[PDB]
Design a protein around this nucleic acid. Structure first.
Ligand code: K
Ligand code: K
Ligand code: K
Ligand code: K
Ligand code: K
Ligand code: K
Ligand code: K
Ligand code: K
Ligand code: K
Ligand code: K
Ligand code: K
Ligand code: MG
Ligand code: MG
Ligand code: MG
Ligand code: MG
Ligand code: MG
Ligand code: MG
Lengths: 200, 50, 147, 203, 98
RNA sequence: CACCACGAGGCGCUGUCUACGAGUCGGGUUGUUUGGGAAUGCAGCCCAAAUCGGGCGGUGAAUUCCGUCCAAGGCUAAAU
RNA sequence: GCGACCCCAGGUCAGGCGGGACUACCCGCUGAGUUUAAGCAUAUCAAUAAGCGGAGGAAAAGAAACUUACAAGGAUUCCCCUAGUAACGGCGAGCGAACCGGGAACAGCCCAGCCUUAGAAUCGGGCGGCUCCGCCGUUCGAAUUGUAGUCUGGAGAAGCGU
């Protein structure tokens, strides 16, 4: 070792040459996955190629709680609120997740509205052609039925907007930094304050 | 055995920025419009109308 | 590019540029960072002060997400406002633009630099520094806390 | 409606009744070979809850295994290596005794399939287990949808690949999460995945 | 308690209308039927108590509650299970006295 | 072309019930292993549970709460 | 002496099953030292080589006794990132994951236990038929020390309505 260089820490002391993974098959993998997707689309025709509907869920942890993404499946509470029996939802293209809990009204209401939109946009063929049942669609709707290729219900964020508002005296007399400092102090000293209150 | 036997994990490919690729494509397209350059590249264009 | 390698220029010069006396042997000073305290001590001390020893407390299973806190300076707040909103704010002095820095991925607002002259700005953020709040108040704006 | 009584009684292993019965049974087992068939399970309820059924094609074998750790089997206890590896005694087999019993039953009974096993008795020198095996060739087994999966070739010698309940236990698979993640899909598979040096085309 | 809408202090976080969790069958994991309790009582009558349970009961009869708890902790392994076992022994002793 | 809803599921209600895996979990100790650090998993030996309970919440311990799941039985295609 | 059961013994009894072979990948066990540390013993080499076994076309894993502390995610597997990071380490040489986030693919289920008792409703073998990977009839046997059916916590039983 010589000169002023960063201290090296290369992890190459084992038989690493026997565990090298190359990517010469990357185009082949892409082609194989595309072929599988095409075969699946042909198989499930006329069902949408994007797959079953998924719920809207929040991101985990403080880093992503402002983000909205797709969850595994709709909760039992959401299905009950939307009037869709849980045993029927999977058969009509709705994913079901019996594990997800509903802690707030906003998420439950959002997913219920999503399910209602899907129901409004859903067309169901009868099990037997000559027999029409409660959940089946009319012949006119069935005739104009096609396979949807892309995502039929994109999960998108409401883009930010900067509006002009009046600055009132109440806002001009608010000490944000002082509020933050006092809240931090209260959080730090809650235990001591409770102990003193209990003692006295 | 040869000295330093060749191995498959040699860096065969190159990752050129997209902007540079587009620059090169635009330059080639512009050069294709210069009759002198087209002649200089070996093409017989003495009979092309324009 | 093999044809540009300097060993090609050294073909026919015996030592290949590594000297007749010293030569190029296998590991004359040990492997890797060997001897950091004994025969490579001068190099470590002069170029890598602080390398040896330990300081501070440990933190088992430390997750970086709970420490996430992007910051933006007040001198960059105006750049978040779209051009049409900036024009509207310039035209009308009775209202101020309302910038939610959280929608742009910022948690805390710091107080480096200055704002546009004679421009009131309403800023909402999770946290703010005392200087940033003072500058916003001086500009005629206000601060709103969110989460 | 009787199995709960038996299970609760077998949870009271320090009771006088259980101590007497287990003492007599341990004496009797000591006199017989290490592997022997039993006409019916001596713990019916435990066998049921482990998948046994009272129908043709199901059998139970009692297996006796020696107790204690694994002495390193080197001549004269001599190790040619560094001091860290010089230990001979106080070394422990990575597999459990019940896994050993299941392996012995499976190797001895090559024409059957090991399903599960349970502890029955133990003394200072021996530990005893009964192994539930299935004759996959029997028509009763092959016509039962709940068990005929064992007839498929992928389940050959489950006990020798750690696929039994004891196998999953000693492979570290009975838990999930931060305390067990390195065990899935397998410890060696995880090591191979972690050590792999990925060199993409565009680096 | 609802979130304050602040990022610091007590009850911090984004403001949402909290919803009580819907009841689910898993709320009864620690409970069992009356038949199971009856069976366990009968089997306890049939099988009696283990020697260490008898030792704890003797210690409680003498009046050495701390020694009984120490013995229970040594036998079972944890202070919580030792406390539970000592309480159960005390309940059995109370039933015997009455 | 016959297409039969006895029965079984779907939905709503209930001052009733609501059964869930033991020498297993857990604990002590020893050996090994792990990034897992008053001990990550595994294993031997010793002790050895519970049902308004049990496991986990990356610093051991006691007290009071809170969050989250339900082990010790089993099967399962695809992405690799 | 007869009979019932239990445990066990002998059958070239009627009909079935198993051993062994291959190595690129896969599963379980066992297990070094060369080497690096400019010496060397912990460490490293390596949870690797060698050794002993077990499968398939993939294997293994898999439906939370999970992740987290959020406005919360939701079987397993794999890729990118996390990250040469938290941590470990004669804190030397070195070693080194996981969660979130973005993608590929997606699928959920079966049992044990209280619950036929107006009758084991279950299953195997022989024999005889049939539209023969199975169905029907008859006869022996297994099984009550429990085969079918319902139930599996996401529930469910029972009762009443649609
Ligand atoms: K340099
Ligand atoms: K040189
Ligand atoms: K020289
Ligand atoms: K520390
Ligand atoms: K060593
Ligand atoms: K149950
Ligand atoms: K269970
Ligand atoms: K132990
Ligand atoms: K708990
Ligand atoms: K028959
Ligand atoms: K059943
Ligand atoms: Mg030199
Ligand atoms: Mg050796
Ligand atoms: Mg498999
Ligand atoms: Mg980085
Ligand atoms: Mg992910
Ligand atoms: Mg027949």
């Amino acid at each position: 070792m010589k000169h002023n260089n960063v201290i090296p820490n290369g992890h190459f002391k084992k038989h690493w040459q026997n565990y090298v993974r190359t990517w010469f098959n990357q185009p082949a993998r892409k082609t194989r996955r595309r072929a599988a997707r095409q075969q699946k689309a042909v198989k499930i025709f006329p069902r949408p190629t994007a797959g079953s509907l998924r719920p809207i869920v929040h991101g985990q942890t403080l880093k992503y709680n402002m983000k909205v993404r797709a969850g595994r499946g709709f909760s039992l509470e959401e299905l009950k609120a939307a009037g869709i029996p849980k045993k029927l939802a999977p058969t009509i293209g709705i994913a079901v997740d019996h594990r997800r809990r509903n802690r707030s009204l906003e998420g439950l209401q959002t997913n219920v509205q999503r399910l209602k939109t899907y129901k409004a946009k859903l067309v169901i063929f009868p099990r037997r052609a000559k027999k029409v049942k409660a959940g089946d669609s009319s012949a006119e709707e069935l005739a104009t039925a096609t396979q949807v290729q892309g995502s039929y219900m994109p999960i998108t964020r409401e883009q930010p907007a900067v509006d002009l508002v009046k600055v009132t005296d109440e806002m001009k007399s608010f000490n944000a930094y002082g509020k933050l400092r006092i809240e931090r102090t209260n959080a730090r000293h809650i235990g001591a304050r409770l102990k003193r209150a209990a003692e006295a | 055995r040869m000295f330093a036997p060749t191995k498959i994990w040699r860096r065969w490919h190159r990752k050129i920025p997209v902007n540079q690729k587009r620059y090169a494509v635009a330059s080639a397209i512009a050069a294709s419009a210069v009759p002198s350059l087209v002649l200089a590249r070996g093409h017989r264009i003495e009979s092309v109308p324009e | 590019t093999t044809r540009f390698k300097k060993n090609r220029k050294k073909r026919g010069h015996v030592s290949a540029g590594h000297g007749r006396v010293g030569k190029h042997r296998k590991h004359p000073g040990g492997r890797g960072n060997a001897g950091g305290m004994h025969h490579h001590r001068i190099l470590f001390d002069k170029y890598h002060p602080g390398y040896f020893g330990k300081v501070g407390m440990r933190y088992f299973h430390k997750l970086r997400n709970k420490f996430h806190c992007p910051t933006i300076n007040i001198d960059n707040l105006w750049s978040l406002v779209p051009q049409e909103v900036k024009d509207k704010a310039k035209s009308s002095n009775a209202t101020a633009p309302f910038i939610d820095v959280t929608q742009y991925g910022y948690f805390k607002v710091l107080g480096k630099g200055v704002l546009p002259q004679n421009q009131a700005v309403v800023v909402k953020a999770k946290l703010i520094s005392k200087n940033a709040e003072k500058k916003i108040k001086e500009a005629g704006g206000a601060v709103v806390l969110t989460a | 409606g009787a199995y709960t009584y038996v299970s609760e009684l077998w949870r009271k292993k320090q009771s006088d009744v259980m101590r007497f019965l287990q003492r007599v049974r341990c004496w009797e087992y000591r006199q017989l070979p290490s592997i022997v068939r039993v006409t019916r399970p001596t713990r019916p309820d435990k066998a049921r809850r482990l998948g046994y059924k009272a129908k043709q094609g199901y059998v139970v074998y009692r297996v006796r295994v020696k107790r204690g750790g694994r002495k390193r089997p080197v001549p004269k206890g001599i190790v040619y290596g560094k001091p860290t590896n010089q230990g001979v005694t106080q070394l422990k087999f990575q597999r459990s005794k019940r896994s050993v019993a299941e392996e012995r039953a499976g190797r001895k009974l090559g024409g059957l399939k090991v399903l599960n096993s349970y502890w029955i008795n133990e003394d200072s020198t021996y530990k005893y287990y009964e192994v539930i095996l299935v004759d996959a060739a029997h028509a009763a087994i092959r016509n039962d949808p709940r068990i005929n999966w064992i007839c498929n070739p992928v389940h050959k010698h489950r006990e020798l690949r750690g696929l039994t309940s004891a196998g999953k236990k000693y492979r570290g698979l009975r838990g999930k999460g931060h305390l067990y993640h390195k065990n899935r899909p397998s410890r060696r598979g995880t090591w191979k995945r972690n050590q792999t040096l990925s060199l993409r085309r565009y680096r | 308690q609802p979130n304050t809408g602040l990022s610091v202090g007590l009850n911090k976080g984004h403001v949402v209308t909290k919803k009580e969790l819907a009841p689910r069958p898993s709320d009864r994991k620690g409970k069992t039927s009356k038949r199971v309790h009856f069976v366990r009582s009968l089997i306890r009558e049939v099988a009696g108590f283990a020697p260490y349970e008898k030792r704890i009961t003797e210690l409680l009869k003498v009046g050495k509650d701390k020694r009984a708890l120490k013995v229970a902790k040594r036998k079972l392994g944890t202070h919580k299970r030792a406390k539970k076992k000592r309480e159960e022994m005390s309940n059995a002793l109370r039933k015997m006295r009455a």
